[PDB]
Amino acid sequence: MGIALGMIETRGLVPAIEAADAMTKAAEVRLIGREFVGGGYVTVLVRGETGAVNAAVRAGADACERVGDGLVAAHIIARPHREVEPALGN
Amino acid sequence: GIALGMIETRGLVPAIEAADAMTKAAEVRLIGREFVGGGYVTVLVRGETGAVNAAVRAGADACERVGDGLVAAHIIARPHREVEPAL
Amino acid sequence: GIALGMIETRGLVPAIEAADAMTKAAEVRLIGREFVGGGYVTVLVRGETGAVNAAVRAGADACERVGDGLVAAHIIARPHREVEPAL
Amino acid sequence: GIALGMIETRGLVPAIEAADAMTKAAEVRLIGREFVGGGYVTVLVRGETGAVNAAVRAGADACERVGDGLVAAHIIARPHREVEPAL
Amino acid sequence: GIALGMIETRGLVPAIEAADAMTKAAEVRLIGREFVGGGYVTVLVRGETGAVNAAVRAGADACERVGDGLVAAHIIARPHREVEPAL
Amino acid sequence: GIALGMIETRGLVPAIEAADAMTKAAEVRLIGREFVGGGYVTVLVRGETGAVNAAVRAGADACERVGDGLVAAHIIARPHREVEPAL
């Protein structure tokens, strides 16, 4: 029940699924979302302790950058503001 | 406060960074996250005018280096009542 | 009034700025905000012909350097009742 | 009438203008406004053959310079029954 | 008949012309019209192989100069049963 | 089987051709067809690893020259439990 947030955005769903797979395999993080953003952007989101989310996002970024049209963003917010939480499925 | 702050980004990840930075930057409420179509994503905040100013300014600085980056950073100090349904 | 003002933008932030400038410029009611697809957004107002013209001029000026800017500014003074379902 | 007239535009604003000019130029009824994706908008009218011919032409001239403009202007005087679910 | 015919266009208007020519060409049933996203529109038909052959040929010819035109024209004579839910 | 196969295409017609060729080339089941946005279409199959491998290989070859063609062809042999909700 760490509250760190890990995010990877990709071009297309296939690199996003690869990313989430690699993230949840690399460390103890829970997948909490997959968003079809519009325009072809897809974002996957995970939660965990800071160290695990760090390891997960590095792993996801590495795994998906060469899949399909690839990686757009790979970002960690280690302590999201309470206001941000509804955007994360709360 | 009824002042409105808005940041538009390319993709969701810079939008969440913007929202985080905005809400840590000053006393503002995150009231909206919009998938606009075509990859645009907008986040909206409300608060007193001075707070919304600092929030949007921190928001723009934070998300402009994230993902496909920043499109718009804007403030409306006194939004018309007619606009409220769209918020 | 039954006159129609429309502004189309690239992104939601210029649309919201347009809608605010429009409703502040004259006695016009904001009747809608449409996410068109591909990033197009359109805001619609109704009022008397002169009011609507003032409103759209103001909204076109206000939003053209906001975010990815302005696509269309258009006024239909007396819409056909066939079109009203689209409004 | 059962003739079908179609105009496709980039953005919603020229679609509404096309629809308004179409329904003013001849007795035709607006039966549809479709957000197609990517920013395409299609407006659909029905009526007698001559009406629909007059309508589509007028709609094409009117919306041609509005916003990001006109994509398609087309008439099918008697759509096959199998086409109706695709409108 | 289990043969499958498919035409993909840029915009709805060429897709409707494709549909009309396809379904008038031979005895096929229009099982779908999909808004794919980004402006792609796909129309799908079923019938016996000869009918679908004739249909898809007719449709490709008719729509390729209409609007932003034709993307794809394809026939699958005997689709796998696993694909049927997608159909 | 629990291995996952995925082909991503531009448009629905190459996607359906992929799906057909995948399920004909090996014992895999088609679990999904997703309209991703912007015109991306993903088809997803499950099966044993060797089968999913043969399936995606064939699907990639089959759809690459169809319509606007192929974007991605990827296998995940042992998908994490956490990924299952996205499938």
Domain-by-domain residue ranges, chain A? 1-86
Q: DSSP assignment, residue B66?
A: S
Smallest Cα distance from F56 to chain E, Å? 15
Task: Give residue for tokens 């629909």.
Answer: D52
Indicate yes or no: CB of F36 within 8 angstroms of CB of A36: yes
Q: Which of C36, C71, C86 sits opposite D30 (nearest CB)?
A: C86
Please indicate if any CB of chain B lies within 8 Å of the CB of A8: yes
D31/D23 Cα distance (integer angstroms): 11
Between CA B34 and CA D59 the distance in angstroms is 33
Number of B to D CB contacts under 8 A, please give it: 3
Question: Is there a contact between B46 and B1 (Cβ–Cβ < 8 Å)?
Answer: yes
Torsion of CA F14, F15, F16, F21, to 10 degrees: 90
CA triple D15-D21-D25, angle to 5 deg: 145
Residue A83 at interface with chain B, using a CB cutoff of 8 Å? yes
CB-CB contact of A53 with A27 (8 Å)? yes
Identity (one letter) of the amino acid at E1? G
Q: Are D45 and D27 in contact (CB under 8 A)?
A: no
Q: How many whole angstroms separate alpha carbon A78 and alpha carbon C37?
A: 34
Touching partners of C (3+ C-beta pairs < 8 Å): B, D
Fold of A1-86: Alpha-Beta Plaits (3.30.70)
- Name the residue among D8, B75, B74, B86 with its Cα closest to residue C41: B86
Rg from Cα positions in chain E:
12
Radius of gyration of chain B (CA): 12
- Nearest chain A residue (CA) to F38: A39
CA gap C36, C11 in Å, rounded: 10
Look up tokens 């409103």; give the residue: C55
For E79, phi and psi rounded to 5 degrees? -60, 145
| Residue with the two structure tokens 């103890």 | A28
Q: Which helix (H) or strand (E) holds F44?
A: strand F40-47
F76/A15 Cα distance (integer angstroms): 11
Reference A60, options A47, A44, A49; nearest CA is A44
**Under 8 Å CB-to-CB from A62, ≥6 apart: which residues?**
A22
Closest to F11 in 3D by CA, of A10, D38, E1:
D38
Q: Which of E32, E43, E29, E31 is nearest to E71 (CA)?
A: E43
Q: How far apart are CA B62 and CA A7, in angstroms?
A: 15
- Nearest CB to D13; choose among C6, C39, C85: C6
Determine contact, residues F61/F20, Cβ cutoff 8 Å: no
C65 contact B CB<8A: no
Of the CA atoms within 13 Å of residue F4, those in its CB half-sphere come to 21
CA–CA gap between residue F55 and residue F41 (Å, rounded): 17
Phi, psi of F35 (to 5 degrees): -80, 100
Nearest to E71 by CA among A68, D64, D38, C35: D38
3-state secondary structure chain C: CCEEEEEEEECHHHHHHHHHHHHHHCCCEEEEEEEEECCEEEEEEEECHHHHHHHHHHHHHHHCCCCCCEEEEEEECCCCCCCHHHC
The beta-carbon neighbor of F37 closest among A31, A40, A67 is: A40
Resolution (A): 1.9
Q: Determine the distance in angstroms separating the CA of F6 from the nearest CA of chain D, rounded to an integer.
A: 24
Q: How far apart are CA B1 and CA B13, in angstroms?
A: 27
Q: In this complex, do B20 and A75 lie within 8 Å of one another by their Cβ atoms?
A: no
Instruction: Answer yes or no: are the C-beta atoms of A16 and A34 closer than 8 Å.
Output: yes
Whole-number Å distance between alpha carbons of A50 and F45: 34
**Residues contacting B2, CB < 8 A, separation 6+:** B46, B78, B79
Tell me the C-alpha distance between F41 and C27, whole Å: 46
Tell whether C31 is within 8 A of chain D (Cβ).
no
CB atoms within 10 A of CB E85: 11
Within a 10 A sphere around the Cβ of A90, how many other Cβ atoms? Answer: 7
The DSSP bridge partners found for residue F54 are: none
Q: Which CATH class is domain E1-85?
A: alpha beta
**Residue numbers of C between 40 and 59 with CB closer than 8 Å to D:** 40, 42
For residue F60, give every residue at least 6 positions away whose Cβ sits within 8 Å of its Cβ, in sequence order, or none: F7, F18, F70, F73
User: SS3 sequence, E16-79?
Assistant: HHHHHHHHHHCCCEEEEEEEEECCEEEEEEEECHHHHHHHHHHHHHHHCCCCCCEEEEEEECCC
- Smallest CA-to-CA distance from E55 within E5, E13, E12, E2 is with E5
Say yes or no for a CB contact (<8 Å) between E86 and F16. Answer: yes
* Cβ–Cβ below 8 Å for D86 and E38: no
Burial of A1 (0-12, 13-18, 19+ CB in 10 A): exposed
The rounded radius of gyration (Å) of the Cα atoms in chain D is 12
Beta strands, E only, chain D = 3-10, 29-37, 40-47, 70-76
Q: Do D14 and C38 touch (CB under 8 A)?
A: no
Let me know: does D79 contact D2? Beta carbons within 8 Å: yes
Report which of D33, D44, D36, D42 is spatially closest to residue D5, judged by C-alpha positions. D44
Residue type, A2: G
| Residue of B75, D68, D39, D38 lying closest to C70 (CA atoms) | D68
Beta strand E70-76 pairing with F3-10 = unpaired
Q: CB of B27 within 8 Å of any CB in chain A? A: no
CB proximity D85 to B under 8 Å? no
- Put simply, whether C76 touches D (Cβ < 8 Å) is yes
Q: Half-sphere exposure of residue F80, counting CA atoms within 13 Å on the CB side?
A: 19
Tell me how far apart the alpha carbons of residues E18 and E29 are, in angstroms, rounded to a whole number: 13
Which residues neighbour E50 within 8 Å (Cβ) at sequence distance 6 or greater?
Answer: E26
- Determine the Cα–Cα distance for residues C76 and B62; give it in Å rounded to an integer: 42
Q: Nearest-CA distance from D33 to chain C in Å?
A: 7
Give the pairing of strands A41-48 and A4-11.
antiparallel
Q: List CB contacts (< 8 A) between F12 and chain D.
A: none
Q: Which one, of C14, C29, C27, lies nearest residue C59 by Cα?
A: C14
Identity of the residue in F39, F74, F80 whose CB atom sits nearest the CB atom of A24: F80
The span from the CA of A53 to the CA of B47, in Å, is 32
Phi, psi of A43 (to 5 degrees): -125, 130
Other Cβ atoms less than 10 A from the Cβ of D86: the count is: 20
CB atoms under 10 Å from CB of B65, counted, come to 10
